[PDB]
Amino acid sequence: PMDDEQVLRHLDQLVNDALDFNSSELSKQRSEALKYYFGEPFGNERPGKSGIVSRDVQETVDWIMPSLMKVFTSGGQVVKYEPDTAEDVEQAEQETEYVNYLFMRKNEGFKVMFDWFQDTLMMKTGVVKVYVEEVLKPTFIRKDKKKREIKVLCVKPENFLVDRLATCIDDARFLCHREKYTVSDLRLLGVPEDVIEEANREVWASECYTLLDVDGDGISELRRILYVGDYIISNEPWDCRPFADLNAYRIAHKFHGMSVYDKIRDIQEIRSVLMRNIMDNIYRTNQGRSVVLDGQVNLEDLLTNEAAGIVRVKSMNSITPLETPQLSGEVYGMLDRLEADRGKRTGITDRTRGLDQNTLHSNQAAMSVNQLMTAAEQQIDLIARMFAETGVKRLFQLLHDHAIKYQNQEEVFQLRGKWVAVNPANWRERSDLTVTVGIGNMNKDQQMLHLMRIWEMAQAVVGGGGLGVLVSEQNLYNILKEVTENAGYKDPDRFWTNPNSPEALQAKAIREQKE
Amino acid sequence: PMDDEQVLRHLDQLVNDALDFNSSELSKQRSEALKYYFGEPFGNERPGKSGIVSRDVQETVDWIMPSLMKVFTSGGQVVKYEPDTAEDVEQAEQETEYVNYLFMRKNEGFKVMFDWFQDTLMMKTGVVKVYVEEVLKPTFIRKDKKKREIKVLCVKPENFLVDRLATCIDDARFLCHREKYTVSDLRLLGVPEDVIEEANREVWASECYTLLDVDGDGISELRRILYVGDYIISNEPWDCRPFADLNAYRIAHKFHGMSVYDKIRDIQEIRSVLMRNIMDNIYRTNQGRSVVLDGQVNLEDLLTNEAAGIVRVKSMNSITPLETPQLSGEVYGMLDRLEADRGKRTGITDRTRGLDQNTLHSNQAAMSVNQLMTAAEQQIDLIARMFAETGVKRLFQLLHDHAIKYQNQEEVFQLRGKWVAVNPANWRERSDLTVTVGIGNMNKDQQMLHLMRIWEMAQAVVGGGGLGVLVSEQNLYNILKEVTENAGYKDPDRFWTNPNSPEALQAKAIREQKE
Hints:
- The structure is cut from a larger assembly and holds two copies of chain A.
- Chain A is of the alpha+beta class.
- Helices cover 41% and strands 7% of the residues of chain A.
- In chain A, helix 2 crosses helix 9.
- At the A-B interface, helix 2, helix 4, helix 5, helix 6 and helix 7 of A face helix 6, helix 7, helix 8, helix 9 and helix 10 of B.
- Chains A, B: Keywords: Coiled coil.
- Chains A, B: This is ORF.04.
- Chains A, B: It comes from Pseudomonas phage PaP3.
């Protein structure tokens, strides 16, 4: 109750414990993963022997990434809102397009997404941070005064201290983010002096989000602490934690899931060892092994690698050359099956290429039954599913950060017009069904089903019954509209519009009826 | 506060530190990469033995380049602007076409692009510089006076000193560019004397971009310093750093990403060693290995390579010829799989040739499912995506440097007419979606989907319902306009225009109605 200095030492103790545990465990694991990625020697390499390391996780990551970026960083259809039925187009589409328009094309593009995906695929956990800034450009043309802009950035997860007893973002009692916050930022804040650590002195700082009770009452809400160096700090009650913390594999109830390294390290070790053995056997067979006596053949055949062929002995005549058998063809098959198993584990793409010109293509029905059930239920779809289910948290965080206060700014969603984004509703609910393992039909198959099935059905309806009783031009407009949606030229470039418009009235009730 | 000379020594210290660190680390890495590229010996070659070096990064780079040139140096559709809806054609198309027309066909062509791609694939980072000139030709025909022309150029990245704590272009506190700026340029500037270092004395100069506080206040904005030789300098507050610093692989939060060499050096080493071993084994088997005594067979078989067949000994009769086994066909498989793995890493194009004449071609739907999902999610697409998202910064830099003040010059975009380029808007937003991993359908697939699908859809609409209520002639003109867009004869060579034009009035209300 009424704590002002003991909170500083308590936070310092918590930060020190987090540093020790996180550093030891996660730094060890991530250093192992990074050394595995860059083909660093494992430590068992022998002097005077090749240190051949078969990079195996590099290709795995480089083939996981393009699928995820194709399925995510293409359009703003990743997440919907689905509000109450009558009021949907008023805000749900507007708010979804707004959060898409500010996450993409407004916040460093998808570069943050690339760094986030590297963090979640390499450091076993990828997390970003959402904060605000202020634009005060005194240009008296584009006088954008008092622009409290929202920015999202990756946090270099080595500086993402958090207690282990969370198992979720909204379950931790303490989160620490280590930043620099150089002397320029401190001077802007207003502190008069410096700490132990030219104006810029590369000082270190930290930010703490934790729930406590400093008002002499029960446990209060979240508090943000600008604990830099045990000095003038910024303590303030907060509302929500702006973090996303992917894990990319969703292990049982522990916070940090495994990474690609954690499940392909054995494959990489086996492949590297076998490659070293193969090339060592080749080198030994070419160089040759022989037993020589002491006192004769002192020249050790001049390393036996001299391009002369003359050995010379002294006086001894025998020399015992031992034979090292050459490895059979089974090892080639072992490498082939090792690569096949590595692919089967996560990168089920086979050779990641389609340069088989002799092969042909044939479809029986439903577009080769959905390309053989999406290449037999690719794990990539599940990975994207959970990636989207966790980015729902980021999208909600940005929606809240706009609903508090951003600006009177507008969008370009197929037509001009968007009011101030400070009075939407949160809707407390999001949906990402249109991406992945759910209904989530990929555009190339969703459009095939849609076009073929529904179009032939509609043609049969028009020919047989009539567009009056059954589907009319109003719904035929949608039949074209999602087709153009899959084509990408949705509203303005190919109108087809005719919902109920003044031009539609002339087109329909003048020439089509009085003809 | 009020610093006029300590800034010189501070900048000198920063430049010296950057020189030391950048030189050591990056110069070592780039020298290794360059030696690997030109097939230079690795240092482990033995005297009197073949120094065969199997070049592997050469073909990789020579296959990466053409895809980049095809996807970038073809048309001005790489980057759009997407402004507010109502005012789009007024400036967005105009400004986009202007920046394309000034970067291309006006500034050295794409040679800058070629050098940029070599720099970003060779030295782990490719960066260009954008500056302004002043052409004052007194040709009193083409009186081109006050030609504040903007020019871009690659900067030979060995002269791009920058601190390591940036991790981004607009995050470094200090950027240094080393130039020559010979005595002619110094005399033009107005300095009276020379430095330690014929009129031309190949003098050395440097340009510094860094934020400081020299006005006795808080840390100010960026300053440009003409720090040449610790002499008369040109200090001035600046606005934006004109660099783009491609990295081509987007490693985790460090400035310099890895290059092709950093991931194919192991493959090159393995292939070179294995080829050397193979040819050494062949040469040894042809030459042969035999053991001879001392004092007899002193002629060492005349190096055993004489085309005579007569050996001669002395008086002994034994001779011990040892047998070196010949390499089996398993090494054939090792070479094949090594080439396959080198391709699968980045150069996923298999032999880059389609002279398999016995092969055929067949399609089930969606044009062989989009050439099998773009050859199974080509890494080239992701590389082009990141290049576009990084060159967006360069395009914005050019737009700013032109919108500040350039000239009253015009364009040839499908028609004459373009006003002065000093009053556009920056729009603070760019889009490169029409190229790459996003919706971004490559022209051959976009055109197939668009043309085919939309064409049977429109024909069915016209036959069944009618062009009146549904899609009209205006939207059919858009259909044909994008069809020709995919072909390159867009507006004038095949008009089809009829949007609403003086000829369109007679086309509609005279022939089509009174027939």
